[PDB]
Amino acid sequence: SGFRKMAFPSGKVEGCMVQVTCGTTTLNGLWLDDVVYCPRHVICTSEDMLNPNYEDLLIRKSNHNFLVQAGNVQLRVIGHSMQNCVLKLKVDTANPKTPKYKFVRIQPGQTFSVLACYNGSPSGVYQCAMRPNFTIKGSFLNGSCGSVGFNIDYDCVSFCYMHHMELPTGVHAGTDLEGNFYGPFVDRQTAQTAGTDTTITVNVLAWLYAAVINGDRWFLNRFTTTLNDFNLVAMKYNYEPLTQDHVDILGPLSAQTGIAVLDMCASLKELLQNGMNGRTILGSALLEDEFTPFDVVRQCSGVTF
Amino acid sequence: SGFRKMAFPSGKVEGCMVQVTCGTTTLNGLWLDDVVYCPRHVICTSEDMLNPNYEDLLIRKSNHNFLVQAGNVQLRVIGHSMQNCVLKLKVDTANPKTPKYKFVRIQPGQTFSVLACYNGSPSGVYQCAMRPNFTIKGSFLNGSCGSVGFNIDYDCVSFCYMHHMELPTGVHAGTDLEGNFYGPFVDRQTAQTAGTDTTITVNVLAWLYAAVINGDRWFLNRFTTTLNDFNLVAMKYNYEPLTQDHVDILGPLSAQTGIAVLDMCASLKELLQNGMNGRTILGSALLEDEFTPFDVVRQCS
Ligand SMILES: *C(=N)[C@H](C[C@@H]1CCNC1=O)NC(=O)[C@@H]1[C@@H]2[C@H](CN1C(=O)[C@@H](NC(=O)C(F)(F)F)C(C)(C)C)C2(C)C
Ligand SMILES: *C(=N)[C@H](C[C@@H]1CCNC1=O)NC(=O)[C@@H]1[C@@H]2[C@H](CN1C(=O)[C@@H](NC(=O)C(F)(F)F)C(C)(C)C)C2(C)C
């Protein structure tokens, strides 16, 4: 028993992290086969980050302008190209540690593990959710850029996130591994703000299931609700609408606990109205929304990689 | 910016995890050079669990009674010895993935990462703290035994915990890597209860210092306290007594913020007195006690 914010094992991704230097800018790169991926803003000088012309800056640089270090070994860059907001450096050597991998774009509410790195060196791993406003509540200091988010499914690493920037509100913004930003952000030192966030309702319900599975039952009540009645109340409290998709996805947990989803919706509705009345759920005084249904079944079933 | 409960990268420990089987019992082992370390209770049957005579069970074992399996490879056991509650299997292959390592015994309030494993395969990694009552609030199912807790310092892995059992309150007990239990627990399936748990006061203060560094001051007050008056109040909320040692440890955070340790103690008294009144500190509506003074300086500016 027990319930923790649990990250994927980072071993396969630690094998891929390199240091990328262009002039005075150092940050992190992802070395897969004979390409290194990193944020395109590595080419920017102080003056440039305000209104950079990336295509302009890029064409003016020789391969030797990119210093790529895998531990003590310098990699020789034999090509460079842009793809949206990620720079792709072609190197002479395939990464012998390249895992089975895929680039995947994730939906809001979906969780991943972040491997925080500094000078191409893995520092820490944590579990995140893509917020509905396309930000992540990360922990990133100077030099964190190029740090990646991933999921594992058997032996396949799904890279979903590369870190680019921090928003003034202390939350974080980045791209998929094809350089497409998550959310309405641009890689420029101009002023940007995260939209107002909402709570991932399907994730809160999965976390209440995890509570019941661990013997925390006090919030269960005799009632049932409907999606409409639940969703009408939910919107009020800035809660994502619960779609029928969501109700089907909880089916395993519902069947495994004996608590039907629309019964659990009535328990969550009451929690939104009255709060938790000086009580905790799994030692939390807040309603936790960074666990997916699949995260709950995986931790509670002991799925390995 | 940001403040996350963060674990160490698990790669160096993943490289060391194996499956250890003895009779019908399978759990996880830790393979370092030519020794596999695992919980000695791998040699128990069902019946053996209440009053196992470990010395009696072990003399009856051959090296070839132990199946060790690193991925496909079955390792060959060329020696077995017990040390306290840890079985040590000598094998004929040094682990090539062996990192720089050392074994360390941690004190209550110290944090570490856990690589939860089943059948020598990792399920996931999370961050923990040795509770004052010498338990951990882990996430551990059947077959999790031999999963380890660790810290990483540059490229050196400090192993500090190996998992052995779950107490009736749903909390976890285990040993250092020399096989000595943390706390008064024994590797028998006998009635055992955790002592009443307390909050790790020094960690909460560190976390309040973290909140200030991250720019939140709402909970500061114009008061100070004596160490003694602080502890008299704190204990009424089941907080660990704060020692002069704890005060010395908090020195650097005190300096960085310019807030005296005993002023920060004054804020905690008030918070204990008032709660948070719909507010949060670093995104928590509870006071966080699983960040050490060291963890805060490591993760903050
Ligand atoms: C990459 N190593 C850093 C990571 C930062 C450092 C502090 N926390 C992080 O996540 N990324 C950057 O320096 C990017 C980079 C220019 C500006 N930038 C920022 O993160 C800045 N943010 C913004 O300009 C804002 F708010 F508009 F999003 C900063 C103010 C320094 C936090 C570029 C090219 C976007
Ligand atoms: C190792 N794979 C398990 C890990 C357990 C299983 C459930 N969650 C865990 O952390 N270890 C054990 O099964 C140990 C083992 C015998 C009994 N045991 C227990 O964890 C049991 N608890 C106790 O005996 C108690 F309460 F005293 F700690 C159990 C009832 C199965 C939870 C030995 C040798 C202690």
Author numbering:
A (entry chain B): 1 to 305
B (entry chain A): 1 to 301
Sentences from the study reporting this entry:
The SARS-CoV-2 Main protease (Mpro) or 3C-like protease (3CLpro) is a dimeric cysteine protease responsible for the cleavage of the viral polyproteins 1a and 1ab in 11 sites, including its own N and C terminal. Mpro substrate recognition has unique features and is specific for Gln residue at P1, hydrophobic residues at P2, and small side chains such as Ser and Ala at P1’. The absence of similar sites in human proteases together with the importance of the enzyme for the viral replication makes Mpro a primary target for antiviral discovery and development. Herein, we evaluated the effect of single mutations in the active site of Mpro from circulating polymorphisms on the kinetics and inhibitory constants of nirmatrelvir and ensitrelvir.
For nirmatrelvir complexes, we determined the crystals structures of the WT enzyme, as well as M49I, N142S, G143S, Q189K, A193T, and A193S mutants at 2.1, 1.9, 1.8, 1.6, 2.4, 2.5, and 1.9-Å resolution, respectively. For both crystal structures with mutations of residue 193, A193S and A193T, even though being the most distant mutations of the active site, the additional steric volume and polar features of the serine and threonine side chains caused a displacement in the ligand binding mode in comparison with the binding mode to the WT. The binding modes of nirmatrelvir to both A193S and A193T mutants were similar, but the displacement is more severe in A193S, causing the disruption of pyrrolidone hydrogen bound with E166. The structure of A193T and A193S mutants showed that the increased steric volume and polar features of the side chains caused a displacement of the inhibitor related to the WT. More distant mutations affecting subsites P3-P4 small residues, such as A191T, A191V, A193T, and A193S (but not A193V) have shown significantly increased Ki values for nirmatrelvir when compared with P1 and P2 mutations. Mutants N142D, R188S, A191V, A193S, and A193T showed modest diminished inhibitory constants for nirmatrelvir, with 2- to 3-fold increase in Ki values relative to the WT. Mutants N142S, R188S, A191V, A193S, and A193T showed similar relative catalytic efficiencies to the WT.
